[PDB]
Amino acid sequence: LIIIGSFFMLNLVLGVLSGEFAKERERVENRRAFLKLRRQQQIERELN
Amino acid sequence: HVPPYDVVPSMRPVVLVGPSLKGYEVTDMMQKALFDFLKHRFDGRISITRVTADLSLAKRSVLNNPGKRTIIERSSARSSIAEVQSEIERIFELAKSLQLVVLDADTINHPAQLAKTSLAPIIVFVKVSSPKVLQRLIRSRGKSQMKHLTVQMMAYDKLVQCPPE
């Protein structure tokens, strides 16, 4: 009972959440925000 | 009637171009770093000379002798072209001594300004990769540079628009 309903279910939840997060990261808005952050970091390095 | 041969100094002079207008703080430190480095590492074989006056008025096919004497009271005799013309050959004599010489000219800010003359110098380009970094670098100096920041962008962008060849 414990093995099937508490560890297997936790594994399923972790897998589904990881897949959802991976799909969410590659969305257009998140990609644009990350590009902005990377460009700002390059600017800060060159400024330093 | 361009002659096949031109007279140039024996050792190529070195000129540093401002990433932006010379005589301003940011550029001034940009070239003083190189000047101190060449002086310190390469002492005993390199001479440093400063040209306070202009150097862009070096012409060879204008006239036989414009303003040969200072007592002519001509428009060109009492003008600044005489001193600039006298500045030309001292680079030649320093080059004839085999010692490398640089030019600390505060007027030339573009390679084309000093390309058709008989100096034929080595031009060193110090530039920031992006104007975004340059704007904040200018901002870091203080409120004094905020006034000339506006005209200081164009001296950078026009210069970087120049072809790299």
From Swiss-Prot, chain A:
It comes from the Eukaryota. The chain crosses the membrane at residues 1-18. Brain specific; mainly found in cerebellum, cerebral cortex, thalamus and hypothalamus. Expressed in the small cell lung carcinoma cell line SCC-9. No expression in heart, kidney, liver or muscle. Purkinje cells contain predominantly P-type VSCC, the Q-type being a prominent calcium current in cerebellar granule cells. It is found in: Cell membrane. Belongs to the calcium channel alpha-1 subunit (TC 1.A.1.11) family. CACNA1A subfamily. Voltage-sensitive calcium channels (VSCC) mediate the entry of calcium ions into excitable cells and are also involved in a variety of calcium-dependent processes, including muscle contraction, hormone or neurotransmitter release, gene expression, cell motility, cell division and cell death. The isoform alpha-1A gives rise to P and/or Q-type calcium currents. P/Q-type calcium channels belong to the 'high-voltage activated' (HVA) group and are specifically blocked by the spider omega-agatoxin-IVA (AC P54282). They are however insensitive to dihydropyridines (DHP). It is linked to Spinocerebellar ataxia 6: Spinocerebellar ataxia is a clinically and genetically heterogeneous group of cerebellar disorders. Patients show progressive incoordination of gait and often poor coordination of hands, speech and eye movements, due to degeneration of the cerebellum with variable involvement of the brainstem and spinal cord. SCA6 is an autosomal dominant cerebellar ataxia (ADCA), mainly caused by expansion of a CAG repeat in the coding region of CACNA1A. There seems to be a correlation between the repeat number and earlier onset of the disorder. Each of the four internal repeats contains five hydrophobic transmembrane segments (S1, S2, S3, S5, S6) and one positively charged transmembrane segment (S4). S4 segments probably represent the voltage-sensor and are characterized by a series of positively charged amino acids at every third position. Voltage-dependent calcium channels are multisubunit complexes, consisting of alpha-1, alpha-2, beta and delta subunits in a 1:1:1:1 ratio. The channel activity is directed by the pore-forming and voltage-sensitive alpha-1 subunit. In many cases, this subunit is sufficient to generate voltage-sensitive calcium channel activity. The auxiliary subunits beta and alpha-2/delta linked by a disulfide bridge regulate the channel activity. Interacts (via C-terminal CDB motif) with CABP1 in the pre- and postsynaptic membranes. Interacts with the spider omega-agatoxin-IVA (AC P30288). It comes from Homo sapiens (Human). The gene is CACNA1A.
Curated annotation (Swiss-Prot), chain B:
Residues 29-165 are annotated as: Mediates interaction with the alpha subunit. Expressed mostly in brain, colon and ovary. It is found in: Cytoplasm. Regulatory subunit of the voltage-gated calcium channel that gives rise to L-type calcium currents. Increases CACNA1B peak calcium current and shifts the voltage dependencies of channel activation and inactivation. Increases CACNA1C peak calcium current and shifts the voltage dependencies of channel activation and inactivation. Belongs to the calcium channel beta subunit family. Component of a calcium channel complex consisting of a pore-forming alpha subunit (CACNA1C) and the ancillary subunits CACNB3 and CACNA2D1. The channel complex contains alpha, beta, gamma and delta subunits in a 1:1:1:1 ratio. Interacts with CACNA2D4. Interacts with FASLG. Interacts with CBARP; prevents the interaction of CACNB3 with the alpha subunit CACNA1C thereby negatively regulating the activity of the corresponding calcium channel. This is Voltage-dependent L-type calcium channel subunit beta-3. It comes from Homo sapiens. The lineage of its organism: Eukaryota, Metazoa, Chordata, Craniata, Vertebrata. The chain holds residues 167 to 331 of 484 of the full protein.
